[PDB]
C-alpha cells in the first residue's frame, strides 16, 4: 500500500472541515489529494496520504549535505512517491525522478484590485474652492 508524501499547502492539500471525525485519506482534501486518486487509478495501486514531518519541500543543507522535506523522505526510503506542488529543479532531478509537469507556473505580480470609483458630491464643484 504505497506511501504518498505531501505538504499542507492550500489549496493543494488541506485539512477537511470535520477532519477530527474522519481518518485515513478522507481527512484531507485539495488539488493534490484528487490528483493522487487519479494517479493511483491509472497506475493501479492503493495509497496512504501522509504529511511530511518537518513540513518542508526539498532543500539540501550545505554542511550536513542532508535532504529535508518530501524530497528527503524519498531519498531515505521514508515514502514511495511525492504528490505535491514540488518544483522541478536541477538540484532535485539529480537525486530523484520528476514526472512531466502537471502544472506550469512562474513568478507573478500582485497589486490591490483597484477601486476605480470615488464619486463625490461636488467634486462637481471642486475645480473651484470653498
Amino acid at each position: 500500500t504505497v506511501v504518498v508524501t505531501t505538504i499542507l499547502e492550500s489549496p493543494y492539500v488541506m485539512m477537511k472541515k470535520n477532519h477530527e471525525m474522519l481518518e485515513g485519506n478522507e481527512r484531507y482534501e485539495g488539488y493534490c489529494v484528487d490528483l493522487a486518486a487519479e494517479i493511483a487509478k491509472h497506475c493501479g495501486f492503493k495509497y496512504k496520504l501522509t504529511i511530511v514531518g518537518d513540513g518542508k519541500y526539498g532543500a539540501r543543507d550545505a554542511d550536513t549535505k542532508i535532504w529535508n522535506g518530501m524530497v528527503g523522505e524519498l531519498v531515505y526510503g521514508k515514502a514511495d512517491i511525492a504528490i505535491a506542488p514540488l518544483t522541478i529543479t536541477l538540484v532535485r532531478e539529480e537525486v530523484i525522478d520528476f514526472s512531466k509537469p502537471f502544472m506550469s507556473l512562474g513568478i507573478s505580480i500582485m497589486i490591490k484590485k483597484p477601486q476605480k470609483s470615488k464619486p463625490g458630491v461636488f467634486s462637481f464643484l471642486d475645480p473651484l474652492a470653498y
Partner: protein
C-alpha cells in the same frame, strides 16, 4: 489581482525515488490526465469554482453623472422652494 504574464517558466511534478517501479507509469499517467483535460478541470475546481470571488463589471469610461445628479436634486430643492414660497405669498399675502 494578478497582472501581466509570468516572469519565468517553472512547473510542478510528481516525484519518485530514482530507479523506482512507479516511475514510468506515473509519468504517462500525468500526460494522460492533462490530455483528458482532467488537470485543467481539477485546477478550475479548487481555484475558481471553489473560489469565493467571481463577483469582484463596467468599462469604456463614461461621464460623471453622479456629482451632476447631486446638482439635479439640490437644484430641485430650489424648485420646490420657489414653489411653496410663491404659493403662500400669492394666496396668503393677497387673499
Amino acid at each position: 489581482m494578478k497582472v501581466g504574464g509570468n516572469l519565468d517558466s517553472k512547473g510542478y511534478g510528481i516525484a519518485t525515488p530514482k530507479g523506482s517501479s512507479l516511475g514510468n507509469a506515473v509519468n504517462l499517467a500525468v500526460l494522460k490526465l492533462n490530455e483528458q483535460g482532467l488537470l485543467d478541470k481539477l485546477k478550475n475546481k479548487w481555484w475558481y469554482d471553489k473560489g469565493e470571488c467571481g463577483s469582484g463589471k463596467e468599462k469604456t469610461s463614461a461621464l460623471s453623472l453622479s456629482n451632476v445628479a447631486g446638482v439635479f436634486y439640490i437644484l430641485v430643492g430650489g424648485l420646490g422652494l420657489a414653489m411653496l414660497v410663491a404659493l403662500i405669498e400669492f394666496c396668503y399675502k393677497s387673499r
